[PDB]
């Protein structure tokens, strides 16, 4: 039972990552549960934009971290190895749970 838990900031980028993972795994012998959209984490920073006074002048930024779960059940060794040989993109962070 291998679960591929992968995070990214850009959601159009993380669609592509889980797409290549589900395609390569579902190619040769795996009954995966597919992409699971675990909730996006919105992290908000309020910063002051003046170098001095004017406390009321402020900017609110956010980092949105998108989670995607892929659940391989009935695994195969060439599926997990040909999954490992992919180096999809910079911007996605993968964690394979054995």
């Amino acid at each position: 039972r291998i679960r591929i838990r992968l995070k990214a900031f850009d959601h159009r980028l993380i669609d592509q990552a889980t797409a290549e993972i589900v395609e390569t795994a579902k190619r040769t012998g795996a009954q995966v549960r597919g992409p699971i959209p675990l909730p996006t984490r919105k992290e908000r920073f309020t910063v002051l934009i003046s170098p001095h006074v004017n406390k009321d002048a402020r900017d609110q930024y956010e980092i949105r971290t998108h989670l995607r779960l892929v659940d391989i059940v009935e695994p195969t060794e060439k599926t997990v190895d040909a999954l490992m040989r992919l180096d999809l993109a910079a911007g996605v962070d993968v964690q394979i749970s054995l």
Binding site: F9, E43, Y61, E62, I63, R64, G91
Partner: protein, 100 residues
Amino acid sequence: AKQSMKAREVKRVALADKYFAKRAELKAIISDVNASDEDRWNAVLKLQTLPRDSSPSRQRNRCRQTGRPHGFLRKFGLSRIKVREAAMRGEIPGLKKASW
């Protein structure tokens, strides 16, 4: 922002990791619940006779670029002005202007 202060913070970090490896060991004698009274009093004094820098309550977490004490954020490790500059320039990944 006074290069001597950046030198002071980098002096404190260098003492901090080393005598923090020593300090977490020697600080456990004072307050476990039941070590002794002799070694409690001994550990108090030997904890005192370390340099004051190498206590991690003495660092300020200054900014990396300007070295500014106030307005710090721990996520980026910068001050607020340099976070705004790097966010507008696009240097920080995934940081959009939030509106909701």
